[PDB]
Amino acid sequence: YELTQPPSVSVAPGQTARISCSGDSLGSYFVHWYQQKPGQAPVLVIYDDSNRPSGIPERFSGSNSGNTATLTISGTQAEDEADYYCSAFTHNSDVFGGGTKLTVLPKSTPTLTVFPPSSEELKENKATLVCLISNFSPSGVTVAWKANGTPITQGVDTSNPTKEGNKFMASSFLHLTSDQWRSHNSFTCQVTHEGDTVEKSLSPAE
């Protein structure tokens, strides 16, 4: 099976962050926690449920009982913003949990920038609609496109988010034929972030 972790945990600076990890009879196994910052190798922060390796701050503590292991970070700072992976060698096939991205408040709403297809691309009978998503925190976004008002699924390609200092950036593309671009009245890039929607529209008629 799988070691289950919440995909994201948001906390205010100085508050206590709690990241859970669930698995079948997990309490009867030894749980390790890894901290990973973008472009870096994972760092062992907790081993054997509650043990801190040398050089790891007292803020980090852990526990494991029953079905769930928990990583606790008291007095959460900006430097604790990272991906956290639980790990255990159990009877199930997964040695690592899916990971939890830890974000420190305040939250940031995404800003959209939308581009219509170039004349150069329409001359090639294609039409790529560009949606640039920036200045959002935490990293979780849902991107949906619309033809007029109808939801469009085909030709949609959305990037994974990337950390640009304190905020995240992502992109989405809607590939259509030049005829499909011309036929519709509008097109909409809709971004869902923390239960809130943000939209920007494009109109072929200019």
Add this chain to the structure above:
Amino acid sequence: IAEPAMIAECKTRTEVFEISRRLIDRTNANFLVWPPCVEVQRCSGCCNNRNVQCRPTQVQLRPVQVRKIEIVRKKPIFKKATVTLEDHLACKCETV
């Protein structure tokens, strides 16, 4: 000389107890335990009287946490395991 021998008294003595694959779980032996052995308190020694043997008056059950290291699997497994250690508190030479 040589120095006269002193009998080994019937008393509690620090002994080494090997954490065996058989006693706790009987599924198979191909699993290693950590630590492999621990110290216990046992009755050892001799009796002045012929008929008699050194024996424990009372025992104390002491549980300890060890780890089962299963090797003969698709991947290694490091499972927690509790093992009950028997400690002797008093020894006496008993009639048999």
Add this chain to the structure above:
Amino acid sequence: EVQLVESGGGLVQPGGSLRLSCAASGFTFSSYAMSWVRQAPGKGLEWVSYISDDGSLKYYADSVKGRFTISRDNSKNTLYLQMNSLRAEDTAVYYCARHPYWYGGQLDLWGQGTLVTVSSAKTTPPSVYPLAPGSMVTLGCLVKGYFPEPVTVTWNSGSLSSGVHTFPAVLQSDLYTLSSSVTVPSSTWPSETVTCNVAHPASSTKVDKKIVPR
């Protein structure tokens, strides 16, 4: 100074083979059990294989069983991973890590990682399109259908630095696509020339696209 250095990563075709190496230094490599851990781009950690301190016991994840082989050379202080019958799903950064104890599964020391890309795609230069809008102007650049990564996007040959944002690449089919944007003062464009410079080092390509209102 304790260290682990992975090497051997590269671009490879599906069904192809690659051997990864991991050079250990600053410690007695022979006394420690080792693991390979991989991480697909934008994804999580996946344990791959485990090797005993002496090489006697070798374990594999079910996703690599029968195709990957772990081995070590204690005289050379080197860990190896022989990867055969490679698939697109094997694309990841491969980490080499040390288990401090034979009776423990935690990972003490990690290397920096080696990237393995498994693809049937051919070296393709990008198609570059200028992106014009429909007190500050935001201009863009669409860099479409290139392989492999990376491309390098500059604006006005490096003159424009502030306000430049190169968005993450997306895998459209077998090829990559990205867009770069630049926020310039409205009195600067279209009064002055705003150019997008795109280089694809793998195909030795260099393309410039002027952003003209259209």
